């Protein structure tokens, strides 16, 4: 294409942009044998992302960027039921079934037709199909072979859809467990590998233990009391234990919920009242409430302490609960 020479200079060094038979451009990381795509709309999206390197912590960064992507991709308009019906309509039930470009295109069309019928003024089917194919083959097509697995695509869509966190957990467990509902080390490892293929695409894989899924499986099966197989309830409990390699999805759910939160409080640095979004309350001092705008920059008022405990309200508070925790912090400061 004529845009190859024009936009090959948008990135430099080892990155090597190449075109695909489906006329979608993609970069090449040749010695890692890993490849990623970059559409011009996703190019400007990533350029906007690159200015948002101000997040101090890891999980917050991943959740905020993934929320920005999901809202930009308009895949937050997709529910669990529509995606499940679309995947069951194309008979993509075997997790190890090879998937060509055409089957993914058909399933994406099935999803996005319903999405546009619900969001005529918000969803454009061909552009959204191109964007979602771009992202999915970014995550799970690093080899440029045109073949992916049904399980990885299912995991990506279910994680990036609009549904309850435990509902997505249960569906993914059913996808990876057998007909008896049992999951051994290998299926859990495959699911964790598919999950860890996501942060490496953006560049925050090492902060959560790297790409080594073995410690995660070891922790999960140690919580399983060394059981040969794990169950859905034990999987949910271990997930609520907030492991290192999976906390990003509940952090995403929280930030999505708190995006519409409005707290009647004042920021104890930038004096912003009312607090909109995330409210953070210190568990040591009194009358100290900070907004996430100053929290993410790392600026601290009155300095930190030997220990500086913090609670993170993501929803408008209940007066009973905050009076209880105020009584707790008075009790703590009394001692």
């Amino acid at each position: 294409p004529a845009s190859q020479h024009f936009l090959s200079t948008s990135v430099q060094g080892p990155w090597e942009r190449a075109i695909s038979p489906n006329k979608v451009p993609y970069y090449i990381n040749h010695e890692t044998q890993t490849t990623c795509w970059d559409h011009p709309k996703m190019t400007e999206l990533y350029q906007s992302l690159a200015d948002l390197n101000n997040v101090r912590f890891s999980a917050y960064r991943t959740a905020m960027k993934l929320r920005r992507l999901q809202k930009a991709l308009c895949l937050d308009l997709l529910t669990l039921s529509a995606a499940c019906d679309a995947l069951d309509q194309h008979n993509l039930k075997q997790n190890d079934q090879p998937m060509d470009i055409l089957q993914i295109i058909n399933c994406l069309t099935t999803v996005y037709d319903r999405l546009e019928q619900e969001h005529n003024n918000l969803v454009n089917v061909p552009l959204c199909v191109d964007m979602c194919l771009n992202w999915l083959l970014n995550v799970y097509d690093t080899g440029r072979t045109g073949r992916i697995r049904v399980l990885s695509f299912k995991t990506g869509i279910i994680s990036l859809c609009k549904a309850h966190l435990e509902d997505k957990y249960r569906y993914l467990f059913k996808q990876v467990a057998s007909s008896t509902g049992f999951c051994d080390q290998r299926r859990l490892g495959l699911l964790l590998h598919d999950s860890i293929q996501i942060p490496r695409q953006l560049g925050e894989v090492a902060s959560f233990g790297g790409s080594n899924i073995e410690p995660s499986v070891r922790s999960c099966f140690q919580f399983a009391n060394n059981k040969p197989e794990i169950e859905a309830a034990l999987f949910l409990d271990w997930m609520r234990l907030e492991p290192q390699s999976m906390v990003w999805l509940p952090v995403l759910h929280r930030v999505a919920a708190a995006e519409t939160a409005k707290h009647q409080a004042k920021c104890n640095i930038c004096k912003e009242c009312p607090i909109i979004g995330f409210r953070y309350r210190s568990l040591k001092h009194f009358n100290y409430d900070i907004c996430q705008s100053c929290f993410f920059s790392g600026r601290v008022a009155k300095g930190h302490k030997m220990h500086y405990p913090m609670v993170e309200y993501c929803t408008p508070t209940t007066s009973g609960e905050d009076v209880r925790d105020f009584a707790k912090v008075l009790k703590n400061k009394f001692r």
Binding site: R254, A257, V311, E312, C314, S319, G320
Partner: protein, 48 residues
């Protein structure tokens, strides 16, 4: 006197009503509006 002064004792009941109202400014309607996620619990207290 009984027709004038015991007309103020009802202000004590007025206090009782005001107090019991004010011990419940968030217990009156806990759900309030925009009742999303009504079968689980979403709260955090540790920075990650």
């Amino acid at each position: 006197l009984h027709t004038v002064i015991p007309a103020v004792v009802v202000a004590a009941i007025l206090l009782i009503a005001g107090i019991i109202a004010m011990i419940c400014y968030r217990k009156k309607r806990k759900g309030k509006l925009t009742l999303e996620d009504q079968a689980t619990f979403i709260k955090k207290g540790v920075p990650i």
